[PDB]
C-alpha cells in the first residue's frame, strides 16, 4: 500500500472495488503456475526475452574511466521494456475477464505496447494520448492504429500525459466491469506502482545473471532515467538488498534545472497528492506541466517507491538536460551503432559523466529503456 | 563458385584480385575458432541472437489449418535478418585489415545494418542507394547518418537498387586495398553468394533447434520471402539435406506477374548474366537488365541469389509469388491478430503461408521466417489503405 509515507490509494470510493479486486485477482494469480508460465512462454517466444548485456567497448574505451554496460530493452518487442509490464497486465485481465485494455501514453510506447498485448490475446484497445504527444511521436501512432487499437486524442487542459491519464481515468470508472486500465509506468493508487514494479522486475533479475556471468561480480553502480519509474525499478528491484551496488535515478533537467521546462518531479517537485498516489509532483499547490525533449519522462509526479528510496537513500536522484540528452544519442549511435530512445539517452548522458570518474576495474550498468526510431523527427529538427 | 550452372564469378579483370583475396581470406577464418568467438559474441550480446521461433496460436486457429510458428527475425537489433551478415562480413573485413565498408541497399535494412556493424567496427561507412529509394525510405537514410554512414544518392541510370550496385562496384575496383564492398543478399560473384548464405545459417540452426523442443520433430514446410534470396537461405540451407522439409522461397508478384511491374525473377525472369553472376534476372528484348517493381522495397533487386536458381532447377525448393495486395493484407492481419508489424517484405511469406495452411492439416507445421519489423513501412501502407 505504502513506501514509507508515500504511495497510498486516495481514489473516489467508486474505484475502491475494482482497485481491491485487482488487488485479490493479483495476489492470487502473482504465483499461479499457469499464469507464471504463460507469461514467461509469452516474454520468451513474443517479446524475445532475455535481452542481452552488451558491454560498450568503444565508448568505455573512449571515456577512459568504468565499464560501461547496456541492458538492451531496445531490443524487447515493441522496442522498449513497456512490452513486459503490458504483457503481465493484460494477462491478468484477460483471466479476471476483461474484454477490453485502456491505458494513456506519451512516447506512445506504452501505447504500442499495450495495443501489441491487446492484438495478442484478442482484446479491444483504446488509448488516451495528449494532441502534443499524437504530433511528436506519429510513428507510434500509425502503429496502435495498425496494431487494431483506438486512439483518443485529449486536447483539453495541458492537452498531455497528465491529461490523458486525467481521461483514462474519468472511462474506468464508467467501464471497470469488462475494461482494464493498463497503468504504463510505477504510479497511480495501490496496487499499480507494486504491479507495475514486479512485472518490471526480470530486467534486474537478468542483468544480475547477465554481469556475474560476464564480469563475476555484481556492478558497483547502475544508471536508469526516471519518468513515471517504471524501467528503474525494473532493474533496480533485484539489487535493492546489495549494499555494495549503488542505484542512479536519471530525471529531464529539460532546459535546466532552474529554468522552469524540466521534468524533474524528485529533484525540484514538492510532495503531494495526485492521481490516487502521494508522491512527488511539480506544482506552482497546482500541479505544474512538464517539459522535457524525451516525451516519454514528459510527466509532472514519478512513482512513490521512487519517493521513498530517494527518502531512505537508497537510491540518488539526478538529472540531465536536453542538450546532454541529445549529445548521448549521437555519441551511442555513433560509436556503439546502437540509436537509443532519448529517454534513455538521459542515462546514457549520466553514465558517461560517472563513468569518468570512476575507475577502469569498476563497472556500470545503464538500462537502455528504448530503441530511438520513434525519436528520428525529433532529433532531426533538434539538428 | 557454383550451384548448378548457376553463379560463377562473371566479372572483368580488374575484379579477379579483389574477389580471389575476399575468397582466401574467408577460407581462413570460416572456421578459425577466435573469428567465430567474436562473430558470436557480437551476434549475442549486440544483435540479440538467439531470436525466438513463435507460435502464432491465434492466426493458426483462425485458419483452422496447420501450425503457423514465425522465426523472429524482426527482433534482431536493426530488425532485420540483415545484421547477421553485416556483422559477419565487417568482422571479416576488419581481419582482412580494411578500414573502410561500402554497401549497397534499397530498402535501406541492409544499409543500416551496414552503418550499424561500422560503427561497432569502428570503420568508415559509404553506402550506395538509388536516389528513387532516398526519397522512398527518407527515415533509414537518416538512421544511416545518425550512425555515422554517409549516403551517396545514385544518379545513374535508373536511380534503383541495381545501379547502386554498379555505383558500388566501381568503388570497390578503385578502393578495394582499404575498402571491403558488404553485399546484403546471396548475390553477386563468388565467394558471395556462399558467404552471405552462410552468415544466414544462424537462421535455420537456431529454428531447426527451436522446433525440435518446441514440437519434437523437423517442420512441414518453411516459408520465406525471396528477394536476393539471403533470409531464405539462411533459414533453408540447414534442411536441405532433411528431404521431408518442403522449401518454399515467395517472390515479390507486383501488379501481377502478367501485369510486366512485379520481380518475381525466378517466376517469370529469364536466365542471364549481371553483376557477376549466372542466375534469373528480368530482361529487355535487347537482353539488359529490365527494372522491377514491388509495394516492398526490399523485393526490388531485378535478379535472385544463384544458389535459388540451383534449388530451383534440382527441385528441393517451390517457388511462387504473392501480389501487393496479398501482402498488404497480411501486414495488416499480422498486425491486429498477433500484435506483430512484419517488414512488407516479410509480410509476402505470411501471405502465401496463410493459403498454404489452409489447405492442410492441423497436424502439419509451418516455419515462415519473419524476416524484418515494419516500422521502415509505416508511410507505405498508410498510402496504400
Ligand atoms: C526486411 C527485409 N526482408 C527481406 C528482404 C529481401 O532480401 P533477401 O532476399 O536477401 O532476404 C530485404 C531486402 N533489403 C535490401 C534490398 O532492398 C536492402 O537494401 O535493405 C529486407 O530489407
Ligand atoms: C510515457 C511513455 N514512455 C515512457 C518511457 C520511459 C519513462 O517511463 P518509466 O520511467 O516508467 O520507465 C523510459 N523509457 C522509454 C523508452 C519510455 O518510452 C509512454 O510510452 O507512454
Ligand atoms: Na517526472
Ligand atoms: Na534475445
Ligand atoms: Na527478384
Redesign the interface.
Known sequence: MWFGEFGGQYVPETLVGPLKELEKAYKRFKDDEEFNRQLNYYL???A?RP?????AK?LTEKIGGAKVYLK?E??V?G?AHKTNNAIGQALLAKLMGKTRLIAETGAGQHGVAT??????L?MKVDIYMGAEDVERQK?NV??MK???ANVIPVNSGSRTLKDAINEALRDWVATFEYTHYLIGSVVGPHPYPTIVRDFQSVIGREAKAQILEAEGQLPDVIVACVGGGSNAMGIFYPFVNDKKVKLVGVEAGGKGLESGKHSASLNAGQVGVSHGMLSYFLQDGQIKPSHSIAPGLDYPGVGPEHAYLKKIQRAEYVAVTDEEALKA??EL???????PALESAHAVAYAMKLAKEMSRDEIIIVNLSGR??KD?DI??KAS
Open positions: 520468451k517466444t513474443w524475445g535481452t542481452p548485456l552488451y558491454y568503444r538492451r531496445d531490443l518487442h522496442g495495443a501489441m498485448a491487446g492484438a495478442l484478442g510513428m500509425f502503429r495498425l496494431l487494431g544519442f549521437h549511435s555513433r560509436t556503439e551503432g546502437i540509436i530511438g526510431d528520428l532529433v532531426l
